[PDB]
Amino acid sequence: SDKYYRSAYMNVDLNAVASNFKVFSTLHPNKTVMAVVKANAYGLGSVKVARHLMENGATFFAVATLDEAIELRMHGITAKILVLGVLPAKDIDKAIQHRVALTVPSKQWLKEAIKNISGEQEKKLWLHIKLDTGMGRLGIKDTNTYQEVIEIIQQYEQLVFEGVFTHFTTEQYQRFKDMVNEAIKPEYIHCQNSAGSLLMDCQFCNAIRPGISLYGYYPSEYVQQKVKVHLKPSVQLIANVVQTKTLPTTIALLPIGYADGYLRIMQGSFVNVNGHQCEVIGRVCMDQTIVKVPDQVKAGDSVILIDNHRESPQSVEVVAEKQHTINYEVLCNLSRRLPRIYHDGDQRFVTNELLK
Amino acid sequence: SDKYYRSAYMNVDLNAVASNFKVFSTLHPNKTVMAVVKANAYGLGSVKVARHLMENGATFFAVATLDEAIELRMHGITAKILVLGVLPAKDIDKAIQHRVALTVPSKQWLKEAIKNISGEQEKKLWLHIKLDTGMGRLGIKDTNTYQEVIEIIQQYEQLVFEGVFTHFDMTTEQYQRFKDMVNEAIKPEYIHCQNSAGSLLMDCQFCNAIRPGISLYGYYPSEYVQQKVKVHLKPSVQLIANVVQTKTTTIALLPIGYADGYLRIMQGSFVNVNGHQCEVIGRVCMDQTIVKVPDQVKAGDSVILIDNHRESPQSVEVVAEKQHTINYEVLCNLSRRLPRIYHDGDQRFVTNELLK
Ligand SMILES: *Cc1c(COP(=O)(O)O)cnc(C)c1O
Ligand SMILES: *Cc1c(COP(=O)(O)O)cnc(C)c1O
């Protein structure tokens, strides 16, 4: 769709994303798969990912913020959408207006949300209650308070107790069941992320929340080792040589740098130039990376910096190890400046945020 | 202008940027100040920054890529624009069509570019030749090739040899090398070698344009430059979030995380919660950050993560030290998900990429 004018880009394999989504629905054929497309689908492009997943049966998405929900709605996503973070109470009408479900983290928040609803928006307010079941970050910890909140919701016909959830293990899961069994059960009961949806069946819940594994990565090497399914990595990060120089070794200049999310710490990494592992030398610049190459490498040759294979020296996890971080952040680092080139069979289309 | 629905954002002070720009033109009254707004003006937002700079006399911008240049043209920018990186030769008509000047890094590139020009685009191709004066990076290192490239340009009425440039005891040799190469051929209209450091520290009688980048935004390229200069620079960026929930030692939850550019390494940093220095504890998550806070801290309290002062424990340089990187990268890391709230006098307007 969009044009692009620099030879540096991500390939995003939508067939891989659909195939990983199908792993989850195949393994839990009686659960709603709430696809987590927060943070711009972990760097891949939430609008195009969410649209593709809807074309592959997805009916419920989760995002981190209301902006992320609205962005989906504005681009024709009609699926159910849950915001996982805490909406500012003043913005309540906007969530009601765009048919966006919200997370209830506390009784205080719910009381404030109610006070901010005017008569202007009159559609249902869909609510999922977040229980803190030990972990200790966002959510309601006491059963009594859980009951109070349900009672407040039932007071208002505009408010819907659509769901209840938590986030992680065995003891915590038991705590979740104990809290939830102390009250009427809502339509959606969910506690599993990617790891949970791969490791545990959890028959008590009727919906799951796979995030990173939809895009083809395990949340940890333990999960990768423990669970004997196959995920398809969806991302390649590619750049073409723009100039070669001899300075007894040839070097190649790539039009990509830390402003694209190829961080300075990548210096000393190896990248893939037509089959050859080539070291990244000298400082990674804002817009340029230098690679030590064999003498036959010329301007126009493609370089794989991130490859769509788990067992690869350019894999996301190896990139994460170089960055002293986790695969999640490597992907989130990839910046707006990179066109995303979506592959769906032999169909190819491009998002380029700079020309929107 | 734009609305936003999460209490995390950047304040961008356009008055500070205009003031820093004025520092450069005051230091160099006889030089064109080619304001570098590449990489979305180092995270500030290239459109809003370039528009503001044009309103304050700026007539020439430099960007990294043609996409960045067309982005400016699409938003009313009429100034000259130079692309500093290497355009794919097949896209040459697009640069010509949009009156964007291009960098010549090599003879080979130039011949490829000329081949791709359509008989039907007949506006000028404005060219700046990049010289490699000792860095062994982008551009022409040999005087004979430089002359050969000029002579090729002279053969085509459609092409203009508009400029020649390079990029920097180390730098004394390079400067002499630049003067020597340029003196061996006809001089073009624009001669330029100085970045922010070069512009703050050197005269360069020979050049007639400068290319300040990071210092336009209020940051020194190094402590050494900060110490040696007699000017003041005004930092232009704050990074702010509000507490969304507190839990009892009181902890505070912030709606910002590593997907926003506040990377996992920020764990153990201190932030400013209404005047109190407070430690980032536990893991920094994709969308959420946990801070140890005084008992009096409540939902809604504002927190400075990056402050607009050089001598602050939340300064961009301190943040860079925590990230084991440089100030440039800290800025570049700040993701599309954060609204930019522009300040210009008492005027305030918001850019929110997700709702664009
Ligand atoms: C991010 C998130 C998920 C998804 O986690 P992954 O490890 O990426 O699968 C699930 N639930 C909540 C509440 C989240 O915030
Ligand atoms: C980025 C850049 C500059 C400006 O560098 P700063 O240190 O940010 O001033 C100057 N010239 C070229 C070619 C650049 O790429």
Author numbering:
A (entry chain B): 2 to 169, 179 to 257, 274 to 382
B (entry chain A): 2 to 169, 177 to 256, 275 to 382
Passage from the reporting paper:
The crystal structure of S. aureus alanine racemase (AlrSas), the sequence of which corresponds to that from the highly antibiotic-resistant Mu50 strain, has been solved to 2.15 Å resolution. However, in the AlrSas structure, while it looks as if this sulfate is substituting for a carbamate or chloride ion at this position, it is likely to be too bulky and highly charged to do so effectively, which may offer an explanation as to why Arg138 is poorly ordered.
Alanine racemase (EC 5.1.1.1) is a pyridoxal-5′-phosphate (PLP) dependent enzyme which catalyzes the reversible racemization of l-alanine and d-alanine. As d-alanine is an essential component of the bacterial cell-wall peptidoglycan, inhibition of alanine racemase is lethal to those prokaryotic organisms that are dependent on this enzyme for d-alanine, thus making the enzyme an attractive antibiotic drug target. Structural studies of alanine racemase from bacteria such as Geobacillus stearothermophilus, Pseudomonas aeruginosa, Streptococcus lavendulae, Mycobacterium tuberculosis, Escherichia coli, Bacillus anthracis and Enterococcus faecalis indicate that the enzyme is a homodimer in its native con­formation. Each monomer has two domains: an α/β-barrel at the N-terminus and a C-terminal domain which is predominantly β-stranded.
